[PDB]
Design a protein around this ligand. Structure first.
Ligand SMILES: *[C@@H]1O[C@H](CO)[C@@H](O)[C@H](O)[C@H]1NC(C)=O
Ligand SMILES: *[C@@H]1O[C@H](CO)[C@@H](O)[C@H](O)[C@H]1NC(C)=O
Ligand SMILES: [Ca+2]
Length: 322
């Protein structure tokens, strides 16, 4: 689905032929607007000591937001790292214990995007005991749970622990709770590739079946769609025991990387998506308009707008505006 139109030779002469088309897969973290809340959740204002791997007993490592060499701003979750040098955002220590240590990390695209691979969240001082990943489809006006993470899913959310890998073709779009990334390894994953594998096989060689279901199965493609993601961090790493009240300088969130892989949502009417008026927008084909090619162009409204289709394989139906 790389081609929107092609100049073909028929029994009547040369014409333009139209196909369902999709833009390229991007490094979505490159287009992210980050916001970390609440105010003052990020270490270093005022300067604060913490326990690091190098100094785990004297705990004299300092986070100071006014010193570039000692600051951990949110921008460090999205930079290009050099070998042996992981850079990370860092929260305040759990000095307010038993008050919960909570951080809301919001990722905004101001464009509907489609996940094509796993969401990978990389932690430096242990992965959370409790975290919820949420998604928005209307630019943060509304939020819905997308994935739950807990060391104990039943204790945290009252949900049975399940894997995306254990789902059937009728439940590939189900929001699950998992213990795989929290149970006492830096990566927390939101399993996209495993959900494709339900339809395409674990080798992803049955692409035909996946394109067929992305079309025929209700809410399947919308499941991979979003304008925003939010990581609600609820409880930090506990090291497999109860909180050590004598040393709270030990507990904090440290995130070196958030990898988000996918393409713009162009309703199968565009193979190009780029920055237009300061935000990602589709370069619409098929006589369509709007940022997602969701509407017909002004002088092309003889028929009601339809999205393009992956079907019939391999090029699908363009379902152009007339
Ligand atoms: C996180 O966002 C939720 C609303 O989605 C809000 O109720 C909660 O208080 C926020 N947490 C913090 C620590 O700000
Ligand atoms: C969102 O993108 C639209 C264009 O699609 C733009 O007009 C609008 O100003 C953007 N909003 C923000 C907050 O960037
Ligand atoms: Ca980093």
């Amino acid at each position: 689905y790389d081609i929107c139109k092609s100049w073909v030779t028929t029994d009547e002469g040369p014409t333009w032929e139209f196909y369902a088309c999709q833009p390229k897969v991007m490094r979505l973290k490159d287009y992210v607007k980050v916001k970390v809340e609440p105010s003052g959740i990020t270490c270093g204002d005022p300067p604060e000591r913490f326990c690091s791997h190098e100094n785990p007993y004297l705990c004299s490592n300092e986070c100071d937001a006014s010193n570039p060499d000692l600051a951990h701003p949110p921008r460090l979750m999205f930079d290009k790292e050099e070998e042996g040098l992981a850079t990370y955002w860092q929260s305040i220590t759990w000095s307010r214990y038993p008050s919960p240590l909570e951080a809301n990390i919001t990722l905004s695209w101001n464009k509907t995007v489609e996940l094509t691979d796993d969401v990978v969240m990389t932690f430096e001082y242990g992965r959370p005991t409790v975290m919820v990943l949420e998604k928005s489809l209307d630019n943060g006006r509304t939020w819905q749970p997308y994935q739950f993470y807990a060391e104990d899913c039943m204790e945290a959310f009252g949900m049975s622990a399940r894997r995306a890998r254990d789902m059937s073709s009728s439940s590939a779009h189900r929001v699950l709770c998992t213990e795989e990334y929290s149970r006492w390894e830096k990566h927390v994953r939101f399993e996209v590739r495993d959900r494709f594998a339900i339809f395409a096989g674990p080798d992803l060689r049955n692409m035909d079946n996946l394109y067929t279901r992305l079309e025929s199965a209700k809410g399947l493609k919308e499941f991979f769609t979003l304008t925003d993601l939010r990581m609600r961090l609820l409880r930090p790493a506990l090291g497999g025991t109860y909180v050590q009240r004598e040393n709270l300088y030990k507990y904090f969130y440290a995130i070196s990387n958030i990898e988000v892989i996918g393409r713009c949502k162009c309703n199968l009417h565009a193979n190009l998506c780029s920055m237009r008026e300061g935000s990602l927008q589709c370069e619409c084909e098929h006589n369509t308009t709007g940022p997602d090619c969701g509407k017909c162009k002004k002088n092309f409204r003889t028929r009601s707008w339809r999205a393009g289709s992956y079907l019939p394989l391999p090029h699908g139906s363009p379902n152009a505006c007339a």
